[PDB]
Amino acid sequence: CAGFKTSLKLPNTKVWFTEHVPAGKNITFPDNHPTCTPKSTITDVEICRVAMFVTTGPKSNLTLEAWLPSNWTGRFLSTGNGGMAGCIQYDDVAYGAGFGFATVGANNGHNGTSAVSMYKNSGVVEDYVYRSVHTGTVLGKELTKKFYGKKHTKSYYLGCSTGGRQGWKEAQSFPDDFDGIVAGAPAMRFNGLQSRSGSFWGITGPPGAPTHLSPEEWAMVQKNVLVQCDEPLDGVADGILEDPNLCQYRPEALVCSKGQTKNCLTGPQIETVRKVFGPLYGNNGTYIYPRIPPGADQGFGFAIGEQPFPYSTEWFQYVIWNDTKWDPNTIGPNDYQKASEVNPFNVETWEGDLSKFRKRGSKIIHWHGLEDGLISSDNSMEYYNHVSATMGLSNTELDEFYRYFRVSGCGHCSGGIGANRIGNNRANLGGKEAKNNVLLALVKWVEEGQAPETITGVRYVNGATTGKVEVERRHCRYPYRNVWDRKGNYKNPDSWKCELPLE
Numbered sequence: 001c002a003g004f005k006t007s008l009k010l011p012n013t014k015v016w017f018t019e020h021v022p023a024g025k026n027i028t029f030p031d032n033h034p035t036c037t038p039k040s041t042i043t044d045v046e047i048c049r050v051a052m053f054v055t056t057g058p059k060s061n062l063t064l065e066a067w068l069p070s071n072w073t074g075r076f077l078s079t080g081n082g083g084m085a086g087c088i089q090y091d092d093v094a095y096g097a098g099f100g101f102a103t104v105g106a107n108n109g110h111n112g113t114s115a116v117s118m119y120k121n122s123g124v125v126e127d128y129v130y131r132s133v134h135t136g137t138v139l140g141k142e143l144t145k146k147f148y149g150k151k152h153t154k155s156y157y158l159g160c161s162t163g164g165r166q167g168w169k170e171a172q173s174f175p176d177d178f179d180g181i182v183a184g185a186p187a188m189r190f191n192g193l194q195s196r197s198g199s200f201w202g203i204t205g206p207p208g209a210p211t212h213l214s215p216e217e218w219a220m221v222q223k224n225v226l227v228q229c230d231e232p233l234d235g236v237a238d239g240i241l242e243d244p245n246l247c248q249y250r251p252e253a254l255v256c257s258k259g260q261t262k263n264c265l266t267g268p269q270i271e272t273v274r275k276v277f278g279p280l281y282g283n284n285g286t287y288i289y290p291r292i293p294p295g296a297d298q299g300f301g302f303a304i305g306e307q308p309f310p311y312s313t314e315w316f317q318y319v320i321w322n323d324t325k326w327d328p329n330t331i332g333p334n335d336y337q338k339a340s341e342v343n344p345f346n347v348e349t350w351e352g353d354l355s356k357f358r359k360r361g362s363k364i365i366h367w368h369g370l371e372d373g374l375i376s377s378d379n380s381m382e383y384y385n386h387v388s389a390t391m392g393l394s395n396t397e398l399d400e401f402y403r404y405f406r407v408s409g410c411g412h413c414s415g416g417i418g419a420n421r422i423g424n425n426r427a428n429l430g431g432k433e434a435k436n437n438v439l440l441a442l443v444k445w446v447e448e449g450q451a452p453e454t455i456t457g458v459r460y461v462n463g464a465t466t467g468k469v470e471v472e473r474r475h476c477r478y479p480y481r482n483v484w485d486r487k488g489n490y491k492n493p494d495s496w497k498c499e500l501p502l503e
């Protein structure tokens, strides 16, 4: 480990340091960009921490780390990124190491949560779109070989949001990198997601505009969504929409009457909720991106709040229009069209043809929280249906290599009020068996050939990190719907059945 510092020679790579770290230690990241998170993480197992610098071109480069466990299963795991960052997901790297995966993570080609480094620098864009995760996986596999004296057995990827788009970019365009992929809440159709996310500030206008809803007005809308769409459509008043596809919300239920001004929506605010819970279309009637589903309150206030959305604003300024003065206030169809046409390095990540991934025997667990208000879960079932149409494969054919799990009462990669903890990361960690942990479910599918039918999530007593299970639920693979039996305790998973009517 100490000596690896000098023996490890990787192409275009400077090894800064190596570091023995024992089980238990609060590893600290004093050189992490100020905007990056977290500032430390616990390793539950003993590792060699390898910190590299990798040159991807004349003015582009990664920071890559490998955390290599003393007790190695033979497995390699890549992690991925978040937002427009910029930041190694150290908690995911620790998560991986903790299960005996030799785990890598890179910073996606720049430091920090801003995409300003992308401006007039397509190599930094290229590392963001595909080249950081890919390159990290190649060198990851190389150095894993050189440290242990043999080749990894199976290659895995784990990522969420931006990291979920990165997982799909791998299945779509780098199919040999990974034998197994968990892709969470993926930021795929990425230009459409930036257009969708940017569009909300144009729809609402600023604070005090007639069209604008305060945070308290949005929470009033969400309460009225549960009145219309919760118990009436799934039979269980848990504040969780088990299948938002059945919910078409009517904001006119809240219309202000003669001289009512409080606890109600005006005409312009009703138009705003209809647009936010509606699809985005553009020039010549071209479809851009689905609605935010009703009930999806988790992370809702990031793009739909009191100021313009940073991720979309920087994309349009730095990457699409190359104009630091582009104004998020006047976003419109010409923007959505230009982003689709520029589409750097095919960051759209909307390829339907998974031939090569399927054929080599690779498996992908796709999943999305139904309570996610930052990345619409509707975009994920549109991708599944796109794959089915493009490849000419029914859901039962796709079941062989690609399953997509709709997790009710789960937010953006974690949180939410349901049985959300499916084991995609530490924050969303539940149990540690294949049936209730998506990373072990991926290992079991790749290694044993036992595909997940359902993925189990749990909520602990009082929404705590651990303890007695209060709610457990077997989340359904699309296009199955979770159906309550109308008799059993709704908190008992045995009270529910994943259903797909064929007659």
Ligand SMILES: *[C@@H]1O[C@H](CO)[C@@H](O[C@@H]2O[C@H](CO)[C@@H](O[C@@H]3O[C@H](CO[C@H]4O[C@H](CO[C@H]5O[C@H](CO)[C@@H](O)[C@H](O)[C@@H]5O[C@H]5O[C@H](CO)[C@@H](O)[C@H](O)[C@@H]5O)[C@@H](O)[C@H](O[C@H]5O[C@H](CO)[C@@H](O)[C@H](O)[C@@H]5O)[C@@H]4O)[C@@H](O)[C@H](O[C@H]4O[C@H](CO)[C@@H](O)[C@H](O)[C@@H]4O[C@H]4O[C@H](CO)[C@@H](O)[C@H](O)[C@@H]4O[C@H]4O[C@H](CO)[C@@H](O)[C@H](O)[C@@H]4O)[C@@H]3O)[C@H](O)[C@H]2NC(C)=O)[C@H](O)[C@H]1NC(C)=O
Pocket (backbone or CB within 6 Å): 122, 319, 320, 321, 322, 340, 341, 342, 343, 344, 345, 346, 347, 348, 349, 350, 351
């Ligand atoms: C700010 O600075 C920036 C940095 O310099 C600068 O960015 C550069 O901007 C230019 C544009 O100005 C970029 O060039 C374009 O790149 C696009 C992306 O190409 C990547 O991805 C596509 C895959 O994406 C499409 O397909 C997938 C499905 O597979 C979908 O999921 C996607 O949504 C997407 O589809 C939309 O667009 C398609 C067209 O490609 C449509 O057909 C489709 O229906 C969807 O609407 C890959 O295919 C690309 O791979 C190819 O190229 C790489 C090399 O780059 C190869 O290695 C690889 O082998 C492939 O050959 C790539 O990965 C391209 O889509 C885009 O292509 C069009 O324009 C060029 C001409 O310049 C044509 O040759 C090409 O045929 C495409 O033409 C169609 O669309 C245009 C409008 O975009 C029409 O004008 C034209 O008529 C044509 O349309 C008609 O025919 C179509 C079928 O042929 C039909 O489908 C249509 O309906 C229509 O009839 C173009 O190359 C460049 O990448 C940027 N560079 C960087 C580094 O970012 C930026 O401009 C600056 N900003 C400014 C100045 O404001």
Ligand SMILES: *[C@@H]1O[C@H](CO)[C@@H](O[C@@H]2O[C@H](CO)[C@@H](O[C@@H]3O[C@H](CO[C@H]4O[C@H](CO[C@H]5O[C@H](CO)[C@@H](O)[C@H](O)[C@@H]5O[C@H]5O[C@H](CO)[C@@H](O)[C@H](O)[C@@H]5O)[C@@H](O)[C@H](O)[C@@H]4O)[C@@H](O)[C@H](O)[C@@H]3O)[C@H](O)[C@H]2NC(C)=O)[C@H](O)[C@H]1NC(C)=O
Pocket (backbone or CB within 6 Å): 016, 017, 031, 032, 033, 051, 052, 053, 061, 063, 110, 111
């Ligand atoms: C994006 O963000 C990432 C991080 O997230 C940035 O990566 C960080 O990048 C910087 C480069 O800008 C890296 O810093 C380099 O690290 C090298 C290793 O540093 C370590 O060792 C240093 C030297 O240590 C010895 O010598 C000092 C005094 O010089 C003694 O005090 C000390 O006790 C050590 O003594 C030992 O060795 C000497 C011989 O050298 C013997 O004489 C002794 O007997 C004894 O054996 C030390 O200064 C430091 O604390 C570290 O331990 C270093 O060589 C080089 O100078 C430089 O500082 C970070 O490693 C890197 N971090 C990570 C995790 O990647 C990235 O740059 C940023 N990117 C962009 C583009 O902005």
Ligand SMILES: *[C@@H]1O[C@H](CO)[C@@H](O)[C@H](O)[C@H]1NC(C)=O
Pocket (backbone or CB within 6 Å): 058, 059, 060, 061, 117, 121, 124
């Ligand atoms: C890494 O790329 C960034 C962005 O262009 C640049 O500022 C930096 O100088 C590059 N690093 C090296 C050592 O070439």
Ligand SMILES: O=C(O)/C=C/c1ccc(O)cc1
Pocket (backbone or CB within 6 Å): 081, 082, 083, 084, 160, 161, 162, 163, 187, 193, 194, 195, 197, 198, 311, 312, 374, 375
């Ligand atoms: O990774 C995340 O948590 C979010 C990603 C994201 C990227 C662009 C958007 O417009 C919205 C969300």
Ligand SMILES: [Ca+2]
Pocket (backbone or CB within 6 Å): 230, 231, 234, 235, 236, 237, 238, 239, 240, 241, 242
């Ligand atoms: Ca319900």
